[PDB]
Amino acid sequence: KXXXXXXXXXXXXXXXXXXXXXXXXXXXXXXXXXXXXXXXXXXXXXXXXXXXXXXX
Amino acid sequence: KYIIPTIMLMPLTWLSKNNMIWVNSTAHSLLISFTSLLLMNQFGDNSLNFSLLFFSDSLSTPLLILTMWLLPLMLMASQHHLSKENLTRKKLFITMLISLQLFLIMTFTAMELILFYILFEATLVPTLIIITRWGNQTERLNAGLYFLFYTLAGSLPLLVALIYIQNTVGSLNFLMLQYWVQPVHNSWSNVFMWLACMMAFMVKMPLYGLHLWLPKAHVEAPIAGSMVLAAVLLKLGGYGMLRITLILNPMTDFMAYPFIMLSLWGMIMTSSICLRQTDLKSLIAYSSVSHMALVIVAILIQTPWSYMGATALMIAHGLTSSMLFCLANSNYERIHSRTMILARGLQTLLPLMATWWLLASLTNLALPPTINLIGELFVVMSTFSWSNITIILMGVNMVITALYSLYMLIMTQRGKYTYHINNISPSFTRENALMSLHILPLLLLTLNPKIILGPLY
Asked: Which regions span the lipid bilayer (chain B)?
């Protein structure tokens, strides 16, 4: 019969997509990003006049 | 201008040859003390800042001049002592005076409270080494340990007090910046904040309670008698009460009320003991309590008149009690005892020193206007405006201020000394020269006391 094939070695993991079904890529379990990210600014500090300590 | 040439005195004594040392330390100190009366005296209506806040200007402190006056004077009487021991021991205990003068210049000049604190306690370390060593009698440790565990017990509460002010109200720094300071609302949490600021300047400025720090340090002599004058410099060195009470807590005077009365009884009872006391150095030690107690009373009243006498008394006491200790030292190196009764005889044995004994004792009394009358009189006048009952107690103190010094005279003005055979040479040039360098500045302040008594004068 034509319904016969040998495995020989290994499957090696094959990749094929021919159905998709609503694409479905982004779902996961996440609901909240939680304040996105903390506020950060870059401008480069000059020198700052006088030290914060008592003796300067 | 003042720091750096004072620091250059440190390599001077170490680099100079073994035969000299004392000549270089005395001569170079005298020329630096000249420049203090040359530059510091210039001021306007409100005294303008010197430079950056490393060391600042003087607003109401010509007391720096007194430290510059004792800058060579402490080196004079310390010649008879220390001379027997090694050259390295000499070089160390001359530089410990220079280190004392280095920190003492820093205390009065620098207009601060945070950095002032780490110079106020920093003066205790060099004096500790001086007092504990070279003690003629025993119980050096019963005065050395007493020197720290009284002052540091009261001054360490400044760390929790001063930092608490700057964390809430801007910053302490210049004091000239301190207009940010708001009046105290009088709360129970603010009670211990005021007490912590006071207690540091309640130990060095001797009351009746916690006063025992002072007489123990004076009786047990550090070196001869000229290092005792450094302990006199620490009484006036606690001048921060002039700065804290005026600025940090001006509305607070309700808590001052019991502390005036505690210093008021440190006038009658401190003078009573100083009558039957046997030690000659102790008689100056208890007289130094009463004169500085007059300043304590004056500060807590906060009237503009009291400060005029308070600042004058700081200079008045610093050159008169130190003069008295030099007279005690001039008998200590001849008789070798602090006993008053044993060492008895002036004019018959000590001819020219007896006149110096007079002028020093008369300054404890109210002489024709020198500085001691000027200093005391404003306080008596300020107390009457405070409360009318005061001069009934203050007048009794005026009776025993005679007994403070006339009892010193009577027990020295007697032609006896039958047991004694020593003290042949009355004064070896410098011995009387010490006494002249103490009284002649007071005689020059008769003509110009405006330079001495000046908190906005």
From this structure: 20-40, 58-78, 92-110, 114-136, 145-165, 194-214, 222-242, 254-274, 282-301, 306-328, 349-369, 391-411, 433-453
Residues of A with CB under 8 A from a CB of B: 54-56
Nearest CA distance, A43 vs chain B (angstrom) = 28
Cβ-in-10-Å burial (0-12, 13-18, 19+) of B355 comes to middle
How far is B331 from B337, CA to CA, in rounded Å?
A: 8
Chain B partners within 8 Å of A56 (Cβ): 53
Residues 168-187 of B with CB under 8 A from A: 172-173
B371 touches chain A (CB under 8 A): no
Helix (H, G, I), strand (E, B) or coil at B154: helix
Strand partners, B339: B279
The answer for residues whose C-beta is within 8 angstroms of residue B305's C-beta and 6 or more apart is B378, B381, B382, B385
Task: For B170-235, give the secondary structure using H, E and C.
Answer: CCCCCCCCCCCCCCCCCCHHHHHHHHHHHHHHHHCCCCCCCCCHHHHHHHCCCCCCCCHHHHHHHH
Collapsing DSSP states into helix, strand and coil, what is residue B339? strand
Q: Please report which helix (H) or strand (E) contains residue B358, including its range.
A: helix B353-362
What are the structure tokens assigned to B344, written together?
Answer: 């008895």
As a whole number of angstroms, the distance between CA B390 and CA B384 comes to 6
Q: Tell me the shortest Cα–Cα distance from A56 to chain B, in angstroms.
A: 8
How many angstroms separate the most distant Cα atoms in chain A? 97
DSSP for B364-384 reads TS--SSSSHHHHHHHHHHHHH
Q: Name every chain A residue with its beta carbon within 8 A of the beta carbon of B172.
A: 54
Method used to solve the structure: cryo-EM
Resolution in A: 4.3
Closest chain B residue by Cα to residue A55? B115
CA distances from B307 to B62, B160, B290, B303, B313 (A): 13, 28, 17, 7, 10
d(CA B435, CA B430): 9
Angle, CA B57 vertex, CA B51 and CA B59 arms, to 5°:
150
- Beta strands per DSSP E along A1-56: none
Tokens of B400: 């025993």
Mutation target for B interface from A54, A55, A56: give the one with most B CBs within 10 A: A54
